[PDB]
Amino acid sequence: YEHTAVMPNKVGIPYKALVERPGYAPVHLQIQLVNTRIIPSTNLEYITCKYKTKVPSPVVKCCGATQCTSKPHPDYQCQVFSGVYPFMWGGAYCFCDTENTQMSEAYVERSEECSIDHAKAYKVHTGTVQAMVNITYGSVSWRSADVYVNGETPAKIGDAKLIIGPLSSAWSPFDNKVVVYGHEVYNYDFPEYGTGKAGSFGDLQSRTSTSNDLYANTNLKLQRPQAGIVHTPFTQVPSGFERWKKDKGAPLNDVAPFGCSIALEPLRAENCAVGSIPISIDIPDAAFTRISETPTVSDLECKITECTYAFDFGGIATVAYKSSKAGNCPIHSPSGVAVIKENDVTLAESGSFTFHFSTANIHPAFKLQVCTSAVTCKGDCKPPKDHIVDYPAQHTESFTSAISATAWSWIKVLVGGTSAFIVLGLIATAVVALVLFFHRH
Amino acid sequence: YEHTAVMPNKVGIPYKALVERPGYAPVHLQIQLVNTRIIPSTNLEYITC
Ligand SMILES: *[C@@H]1O[C@H](CO)[C@@H](O)[C@H](O)[C@H]1NC(C)=O
């Protein structure tokens, strides 16, 4: 039997309801969200890492001029320094005093550590939203099955079909361009491929971790060898990857609104408390029981014992429940001003049962629907003493939950005072007009 | 669970209270003063005999 509703996107707060079917006793439904994953569709653009300036062995020609030949290599530099008299352990490397040439070449590669640490540049557009859901209904225990939040995909949770309806808000913590480094995610407007400056980020960009293009812009200049020494000096801008690592401000794991937790197989934003989720469950007909086989509850009288609008279940009430037959039967408080802790109560022929509830109102005035009949509960509630707690609120405020009787009466006396004064003035104006009209006429 | 109060300085008269904690049954509290000593800091000036 279908049951449509709308529930908040909060994780851990169970949505409770009473599925009422004409002719059958209600069944208590409890749908809770274990987690909700916004899983975007990524497209890798490139990979950034530290560079390695490969410096091959210089070519020393003794009495010749050998010349550069451009090779297809990232940031390849070849220079032909002339007038080199190399000295080495044997001593006198080349004969000709001045007509000696050294060809030094250098080119940038991926560092060996690029396969372990690297930044993946990603373009994110939009993705599936998935969530794990816990449902209970009647005597059926928890089922805890994973669903797709699109509003069209049934999910067979036990023997119930849940069509979890799309998120009201299309908000996603990621912008178009992100950078993934290790377990951190950054909302970085990375340079496009082949644009990276010399030392900021993307100075070394590779499409994949095993690519061969390896665009690299490092400003590598070969320098003249020192007199005597056969070495290949060069000057280069320090890696922009490390500059990024020690200037990168704050990941999205910390910045993220709504308490999104960013995970990185596959790249997702978890437990984000934004908007509402339509739901449509189809409880099987075997769960329902005929209304004739269920207790009928009369003479309901509810008294609120000590209550306080704490985030936890800070309210206790007792209901006297003189009944017809004995057995288990559900309770639910539809108003949304109080959240009932317990799902069922076991009833004897007569007596009383106690239930806990959570609320934000100073005066919680809520209807508790037991079994079939309903009872109205009202009372007074005290402030919680604890300032900061480690658990989220189990209820919702409603912008009237704090007004309280005294402030209600005060604002009433104020509004009524102003209204009465103005209406007294207007009736006075009418009375003068009428008396003057009677004066002449 | 904290409970603040003010009690008389009488010795032997028990101060009684009901410590009430929201959500929990009240607890009876009985604080009694066996004795109260005002102990000044003395410094010997001299001795006479
Ligand atoms: C909800 O399902 C989870 C598994 O996702 C399970 O561990 C838990 O027991 C269920 N809820 C309750 C109240 O048992």
In order, the DSSP letters of A249-287 are: ---HHHH-GGG-EEETTTTEEE----SEEEEEEE--TTT
CA end-to-end distance (rounded Å), chain B: 57
| Nearest partner of A108 among A199, A214, A240, A224, judged by Cα | A214
The one-letter amino acid at A166: P
- A213 touching chain B per CB within 8 A: no
Tokens 């989220």 sit on residue? A392
Number of alpha carbons in the 13 Å side-chain half-sphere of residue A81: 24
- Sort out which chain B residues have CB atoms less than 8 A from A382's CB and list them: 22
Evaluated on CA atoms A410, A415, A418, A422, the torsion sign reads negative
> In sequence order, what are the residues at sequence separation of 6 or more whose Cβ sits closer than 8 angstroms to the Cβ of residue B2?
none
CA angle A113, A114, A119 (to 5 degrees): 125
The separation between CA A180 and the C-alpha centre of its own chain, rounded to angstroms, equals: 17
Contact of A330 with A19, CB cutoff 8 Å: no
Residue having the nearest C-alpha atom to atom 7 of ligand 1: A144
Q: What share of chain B is helix, strand, coil (3-state, %, to 5)?
A: 0, 30, 70
What distance in Å separates the CA atoms of residue A95 and residue A88, rounded to the nearest whole number?
A: 13
Structure tokens at A69: 């030949």
Distances (CA, A) of A424 to A428, A431, A432, A434: 6, 10, 12, 15
Q: In whole angstroms, what is the distance from residue A317 CA to residue A336 CA?
A: 17
A384 touches chain B (CB under 8 A): yes
Question: What are the two backbone dihedrals, phi and then psi, of residue A320, each rounded to the nearest 5 degrees?
Answer: -85, 135
Final resolution, Å: 3.0
**Strand ranges across the sheet with A366-370:** A344-347, A327-332, A366-370, A374-377
Whether B23 sits inside 8 A of A385 (CB atoms) is: no
- Quick check: B23 contacting A, CB < 8 Å? yes
Contact B22 A316 (CB under 8 A): no
Distance from CA of B21 to the nearest CA of A (A): 9
**Distance (Å, whole) CA A323 – CA A294:** 11
Please name which of A135, A133, A160, A134 lies closest in space to residue A148, comparing C-alpha atoms: A133
Q: How many CA atoms lie within 13 A of A290 on its CB side?
A: 2
The residue whose CA has the least distance to atom 12 of ligand 1 is A142
**What burial class does residue A82 get, using C-beta atoms within 10 Å of its C-beta: 0-12 exposed, 13-18 middle, 19+ buried?**
exposed
Nearest CA to ligand 1 atom 6: A144
Instruction: Report yes or no: A28 and A126 within 8 Å, Cβ to Cβ.
Output: no
Question: Does A314 sit within 8 Å of B22, measured CB to CB?
Answer: yes
Assess contact for A256 and A173: CB atoms under 8 A. Answer: yes
Q: A134 C-alpha to center of ligand 1: Å?
A: 7
- Which residue's CA is the closest to the ligand 1 atom numbered 2? A144
Distance from CA of B23 to the nearest CA of A (A): 7
Shortest CA gap B7–chain A (Å): 23
| Residue with CA nearest ligand 1 atom 5 | A144
Instruction: Find, in chain A, the residue whose alpha carbon is nearest to that of B21.
Output: A385
What residue ranges line ligand 1, CB within 6 angstroms? A 34, 132, 134, 142, 144
Ligand 1 pocket test: pick from A16, A144, A162, A341 the residue with the most ligand atoms within 8 Å of its Cβ.
A144
CB atoms within 10 A of CB A313: 19
CB A137 within 8 A of CB A32: no
Contact check, Cβ <8 Å, B22/A384: yes
CA of A135 to the centre of ligand 1 (A): 9
Residue A318 CA, distance from chain mean position: 39
CA distance to A64, A122, A204, per residue, from A194 (Å):
38, 15, 9
Chain B closest CA to A306's CA: distance in Å?
Answer: 7
Cα A117 to Cα A239: distance, rounded to the nearest angstrom: 14
